[PDB]
């Protein structure tokens with residue numbers, strides 16, 4: 001966290017928060033990231049959602065491709081982090097009821 | 098690009114575009130990414146800005162820490178990409194005049 005209190009980090013975030021729609025998101029993240037990086041963040045995000053949907057590690061590994069080690073890492077951030085995943089899931093009504 | 102046309106990628110982007118302020122950005126990206134990943138994206142973004150500000154590779158390597166190989170990679174995405182960096186720089190009035 002301390003290493004992230006930088007004006008560089010803050011401008012990255014303003015850049016990210018200025019994106020207006022998914023086509024802009026695609027353009028930007030594809031400029032800044034590799035395909036695999038984007039695929040890697042989307043996998044973590046899906047693991048996290050499925051974890052809160054109460055799915056098993058097997059079902060998560062199947063559906064997402066994540067190894068169980070990845071699943072376990074995400075699970076640490078989900079549970080012992082800033083509660084960012086959860087606040088998005090609540091806000092966007094994402095969790096399969 | 099083709100590998101990124103996924104519902105998983107689309108939900109990551111909706112999650113990212115729902116973030117309302119920098120504190121939310123910090124909470125979310127810190128949950129989803131490692132410190133080094135965030136530092137790595139903010140470095141690329143700063144390299145890209147300084148490149149469009151017409152600074153030399155030496156000055157960019159000094160100010161940002163990027164190796165010149167990183168600078169050269171960013172420069173490919175800046176110039177031969179989706180024009181996402183440039184559209185953010187224009188929109189946010191970021192380039193030092």
Ligand SMILES: [Mg+2]
Nearest residue numbers: 005006007008
């Ligand atoms: Mg600073």
Ligand SMILES: [Mg+2]
Nearest residue numbers: 034035036037
């Ligand atoms: Mg790669």
Ligand SMILES: [Mg+2]
Nearest residue numbers: 040044070073
């Ligand atoms: Mg991982």
Ligand SMILES: [Mg+2]
Nearest residue numbers: 102103104105
């Ligand atoms: Mg799909």
Ligand SMILES: [Mg+2]
Nearest residue numbers: 131132133134
């Ligand atoms: Mg790391």
Ligand SMILES: [Mg+2]
Nearest residue numbers: 137141167170
């Ligand atoms: Mg790099």
